[PDB]
Amino acid sequence: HMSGLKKFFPYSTNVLKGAAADIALPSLAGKTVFFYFSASWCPPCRAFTPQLIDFYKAHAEKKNFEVMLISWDESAEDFKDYYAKMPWLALPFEDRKGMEFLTTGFDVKSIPTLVGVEADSGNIITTQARTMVVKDPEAKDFPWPNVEAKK
Incomplete structure (x- = not known):
């Protein structure tokens, strides 16, 4: 029952996929999951988002991963407009304390930030995936x- 992955979500059960709000964690079984910390008020986020979408189009089926927006937006309206541009999942905006839990857990101090985790185990791969989407587009x-090993 995705115990490892569940550890990231003390206050949400199902997450968003477009207009649907009934996505359950077992659907992510066997995948890599990336938490994308972002907001529409952030210029580099607005520019990185389309790069990450290009990477997702190219590799999200073959490399077997999913992306979930963890929003630093200032309002529900901003969240709705920004998330609507994206093809992936989102932690519901209403779960602000859950966004805080993940932000501190991964020591996220600025955005955009992209953190990779293993769904099955719940283990962490890296917190510096943003760098790599850019450097390793293939x-x-x-x-x-x-x-993080890099100098």
């Missing part, structure tokens, strides 16, 4: 464990 070294 996904040759995906999912990039321990990018």
Whole structure:
């Protein structure tokens, strides 16, 4: 029952997929999951989002991963407009305390940030996936464990 992955969600059960709000964690079984910390008020986020969408189109089926928006937006309206541009999942905006839990858990101090985790185990791969989407657009070294090792 996705115990490892459940550890990331103390206050949500199902998450969003477009207009649907009934996506359950077991649907992510066997995949890599990326938490995308982002907001519509952030210029580099607005520019990185389309790069991440290009990467998702190219590799999200073959490399077997999913993306979930963890929003730093200032309002429900901003969240709705921004998330509507995206093809992936989102932690519901209403779960602000859950967004805080993940933000501190991964020591996210700025955005955009992209964190990779294993769905089955719940283990962490890297917190520096944003760098790699840009540097490795063909996904040759995906999912990039321990990018943190770099100088």
